[PDB]
Design a protein around this ligand. Structure first.
Ligand SMILES: Cc1cc(C)nc(SCC(=O)Nc2ccc(Sc3ccccc3)cc2)n1
Ligand SMILES: [Zn+2]
Length: 295
């Protein structure tokens, strides 16, 4: 139930969440993540004004996002892809915390808004993942009668060689599997959401301001009793008083917890409460060393 009934969290704090997680009542965790979990990996949020995307872009700046424009004028997109292509893909502490959840048998699903493929590199598998905004990991020929699939290694070569990618079978445009403005979200998002939120014991919301729909409205799909922990630089998910959502601070707040700071630091703090800190340290250091050593 709502604030009217006996709550699952013994107190609304990171400490309360940790005790809940290690009790028998918490089995399945859904993560909802956004650009805020990749910034410490050296990938800025291209939606944040501070990142300065539109300065790099100089008809209108938004055309870069539109599927209609892309299809008749693909060259800008692929030039930008080369410019913004990460120099390294090295997932963050936050990403590997989710790998730990998987290892500990607690991870039901990770829903991500990010296109950077860092969840995959960190060891989440396809079954574990719903890429709500799509991804660069795979690309497809845009011809409905072909739809030939291409791996990132193929797309990357085309991107860096500055050759507009064309399908080897039919010579139609090949488009990364990211959702362009004008495209619907993947069917997978909807079918998975319908099943997963019947099963969820805890919602871990990290590095997202929950301003972009439908992804944002996911938090309202949780059962009334399900605790929701936000790890983010600023509070988010509260109902717009002008236009329910998160209630962290009111006299009725029973399930929602905000931990404010960098996602890496919040995940580190939670891992330490859980007795996972050495495990996380060991995992991150190993995987980071491996990635740094790529030859
Ligand atoms: C090109 C690339 C490849 C991989 C695997 N990851 C990344 S993450 C860095 C990044 O922000 N890239 C990036 C690439 C393209 C665009 S433009 C666009 C974005 C979404 C939808 C349509 C168009 C905006 C940002 N970027
Ligand atoms: Zn084709």
């Amino acid at each position: 139930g709502a604030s009217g009934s006996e709550r699952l969290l013994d107190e609304l704090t990171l400490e309360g969440v940790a005790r809940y997680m290690q009790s028998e009542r918490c089995r399945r965790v859904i993560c909802l993540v956004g650009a805020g979990i990749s910034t410490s990996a050296g990938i800025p949020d291209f939606r944040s004004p501070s990142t300065g995307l539109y300065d790099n872009l100089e008809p209108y700046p938004e055309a870069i996002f539109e599927i209609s424009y892309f299809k008749k004028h693909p060259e800008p997109f692929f030039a930008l892809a080369k410019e913004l292509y990460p120099g390294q893909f090295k997932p963050t502490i936050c990403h590997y915390f989710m790998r730990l959840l998987k290892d500990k048998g607690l991870l039901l699903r990770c829903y991500t808004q990010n296109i950077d493929t860092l969840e995959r590199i960190a060891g989440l598998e396809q079954e574990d993942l719903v890429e709500a905004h799509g991804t660069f990991y795979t690309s497809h020929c845009v011809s409905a009668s072909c739809r030939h699939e291409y791996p990132l290694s193929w797309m990357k070569e085309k991107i860096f060689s500055e050759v507009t990618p064309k399908c080897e079978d039919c010579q139609s445009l090949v488009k990364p599997d990211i959702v362009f403005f004008g495209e619907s979200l993947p069917a997978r998002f909807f079918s998975c959401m319908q099943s997963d939120f019947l099963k969820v014991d805890l919602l871990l919301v990290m590095g997202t301001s929950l301003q972009v729909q439908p992804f944002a409205s996911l938090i309202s799909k949780a059962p009334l009793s399900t605790p929701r922990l936000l790890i983010n630089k600023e509070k988010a998910g509260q109902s717009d008083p002008f236009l329910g959502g998160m209630d962290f601070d009111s006299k009725k707040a029973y399930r929602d917890v905000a931990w404010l700071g960098e996602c890496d630091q919040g995940c580190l703090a939670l891992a330490e409460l859980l007795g996972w800190k050495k495990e996380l340290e060991d995992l991150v250091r190993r995987e980071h060393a491996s990635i740094d050593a790529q030859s």
